[PDB]
């Protein structure tokens, strides 16, 4: 049931019972720790649950199994943005556009992570890339 649990945890997520979906993502990981999906979902499920420190942990294991999802990097730069490390999250949004240069989200959201960090110079040059990638 390595895949059956992942879908069960989805259904539970579709009914707001996110805490109750957290188990079904574990029980899927327990049946296959390499199932890249069960990690990314569990991270987004802990991010919705706002188990914030632990949320970035599954988002780390996903970027290990498949180290090239602009989704998993972008959605980790978010979790790390709320978590506090606006430096490692700035590295995350950077590693995401290092994969996909057409990310109008990771560009704007890094313009914020940088305009709050210090370099208005380096936040500007991403603020003026997000203008290119959106009408």
């Amino acid at each position: 049931s390595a895949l059956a649990y992942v879908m069960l945890g989805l259904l539970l997520s579709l009914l707001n019972r996110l805490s109750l979906a957290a188990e079904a993502y574990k029980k899927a990981i327990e049946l296959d720790p390499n199932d890249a999906l069960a990690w990314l979902l569990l991270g987004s499920v802990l991010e919705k649950l706002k188990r914030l420190d632990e949320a970035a942990e599954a988002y780390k294991k996903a970027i290990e199994l498949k180290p090239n999802d602009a989704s998993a990097w972008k959605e980790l730069g978010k979790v790390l943005e709320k978590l506090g490390r606006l430096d490692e999250a700035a590295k995350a949004y950077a590693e995401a556009i290092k994969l996909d240069p057409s990310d109008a989200e990771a560009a704007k959201e890094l313009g914020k992570v940088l305009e709050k960090l210090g370099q208005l110079e380096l936040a500007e040059r991403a603020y003026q890339l997000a203008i290119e990638l959106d009408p």
Binding site: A94, I97, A107
Partner: protein
């Protein structure tokens, strides 16, 4: 043929640093974050040593080239330092024959059509455009007609405001100065992938 290796990594880090240690740290964040064409200019103190150091990056995927040649003495700083290519502004046909004998690519920094014809008679159909801030993007389409063989790699006056103005005019790669290098080994990484994003996506 460097014809190939340029074209791909459409950016060169024209690196000028005041010390030798600050040079290592500016090829660090540049290469780690995006850029794979590193130019080692010769305002740098003993750049013929820094290139012989950063040879472990040629393995990991870097192109450690030398920059700003002025005559036939900074090619006593030539291949024994580790330079995989050497550039300059326009100058000197003998360091196109001094390197004809050592077998390494040279690129002149052409400014006028004289510098373009007098260096096409050399054989170099790949050119740096220096100072690029003065000639303007006009100089690309203006010369692309009568000389349908010359390539251009602008140097100077190339920032993220007008970088795609040079490219769809028709160039090979771009050399970037302080807008990419001036910073700390973290600004130097950020500013570099900042450029490769605006470069990969020129519409």
């Amino acid at each position: 043929k460097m014809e190939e290796l340029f074209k791909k990594h459409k950016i060169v880090a024209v690196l000028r640093a005041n010390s030798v240690e600050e040079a290592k740290e500016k090829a660090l964040a540049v290469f780690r974050g995006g850029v794979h064409l590193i130019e080692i200019t010769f305002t740098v103190p003993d750049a013929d040593t820094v290139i012989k150091e950063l040879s472990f990056l040629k393995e990991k995927g870097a192109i450690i080239g030398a920059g700003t040649v002025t005559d036939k003495r900074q090619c006593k700083k030539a291949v024994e330092s580790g330079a995989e290519f050497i550039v300059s502004p326009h100058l000197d046909p003998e360091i196109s024959e001094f390197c004809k004998m050592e077998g390494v690519f040279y690129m002149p920094g052409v400014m006028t059509p004289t510098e373009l014809v007098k260096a096409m008679k050399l054989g170099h159909t790949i050119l740096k455009l220096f100072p690029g801030e003065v000639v303007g993007p006009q100089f690309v389409k203006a010369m692309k007609g009568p000389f349908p063989n010359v390539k251009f790699v602008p140097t100077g006056g190339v920032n993220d405001q007008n970088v795609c103005e040079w490219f769809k005019a028709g160039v090979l790669a771009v050399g970037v100065g302080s807008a990419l290098v001036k910073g700390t080994p973290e600004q130097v990484e950020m500013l570099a992938v900042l450029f490769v994003a605006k470069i990969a996506g020129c519409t």
